[PDB]
Amino acid sequence: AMGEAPNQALLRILKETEFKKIKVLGSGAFGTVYKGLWIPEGEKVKIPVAIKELREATSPKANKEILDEAYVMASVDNPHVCRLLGICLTSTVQLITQLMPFGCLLDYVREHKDNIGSQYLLNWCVQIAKGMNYLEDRRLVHRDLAARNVLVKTPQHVKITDFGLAKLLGAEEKEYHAEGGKVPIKWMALESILHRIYTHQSDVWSYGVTVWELMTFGSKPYDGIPASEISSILEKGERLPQPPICTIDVYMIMVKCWMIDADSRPKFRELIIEFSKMARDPQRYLVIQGDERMHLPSPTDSNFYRALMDEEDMDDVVDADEYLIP
Ligand SMILES: C[C@@H](Nc1ncnc2ccc(-c3cnc(Cl)c(NS(C)(=O)=O)c3)cc12)c1ccccc1
Ligand SMILES: [Cl-]
């Protein structure tokens, strides 16, 4: 190739009849997300899936956007990023992915804030940095990293999702340059707000905000502040406050993610190293009341699988990460 390398990802087209036990997880204006089982024909496996569709097929912009999302999700393969299993070409286009049964990490940290210890928080920071370093290696800028877009496979294992705003940087390209559209201002780097510049280092800013969401057990960044004021606040040099549990070691890493010079911010590879060091002595880096005694569900637990799956299905249930095709 003269430009970037050829994208040889396989897009699997999935028959509607391979999907069973469809139940709504959530809805909005644009569309609906369901849980279900995918039973590829004659394989003897049942795969828990999330299924996303648009409500209607009457917005060229929306149809193009969901197929752009499918293109990005089909093109990724890393343990800390969610991959597309395939698409179903019903009246609506439907995107199919591995079910993450504990939901998004934002709601998880809110719902379980009294049972989340320092080891879980630092390990999640490592895992998100690994996922984002992989996306950087693939020249993807995510543009919507937030705790709402990190999903929980198990309490021990999280993955980045929601590639609806993601963009591929060309071979020698350094910055994406957008125009218009809905934007999550409270996670954006200042250069993204001012000048629509997006880079891996603008995702590092959003990672800093994501870590702040986790460390405050899912607090809203800049709560009560209107979106239109955020650029002015940031230009004055204001930033999100130090979370109560954070040592200066942890908070300084967040503050470095929010520096004006994007190239002075940490790289994702460095964030992996620093959070990994801290995860080896987590109580030196986060101060949580009662931390020593805390525990969360593990795949070893009796009703771990039974909580999700019906017992009628469980003999042939396979997690999609173990369902591998050539
Ligand atoms: C975007 C992404 N979403 C998922 N991918 C995988 N597993 C999911 C599992 C659950 C959920 C989930 C969805 N809505 C709500 Cl309201 C909740 N509730 S909670 C627990 O409070 O967060 C969980 C989403 C999932 C996807 C990409 C492509 C296709 C299909 C879904
Ligand atoms: Cl919220």
Author numbering: 694 to 1019
Original paper wording:
Here we evaluated the pharmacological profile of MTX-531 that was computationally designed to selectively target two key resistance drivers, epidermal growth factor receptor and phosphatidylinositol 3-OH kinase (PI3K). The reversed binding mode of the quinazoline core between EGFR and PI3Kγ was an important element in the design of MTX-531, which shows low-nanomolar potency against both of its intended targets.
We leveraged this flipped binding mode of the quinazoline core between EGFR and PI3Kγ to computationally design potent and selective dual inhibitors of both enzyme families. X-ray crystal structures of EGFR and PI3Kγ cocomplexed with MTX-531 confirmed the postulated reversed binding mode of MTX-531 to each target. The methyl substituent of MTX-531 in the (S)-isomer is oriented toward a sterically restricted area of EGFR, thus hindering binding. MTX-531 exhibits low-nanomolar potency against purified EGFR and PI3Kα with half-maximal inhibitory concentration (IC50) values of 15 nM and 6.4 nM, respectively.
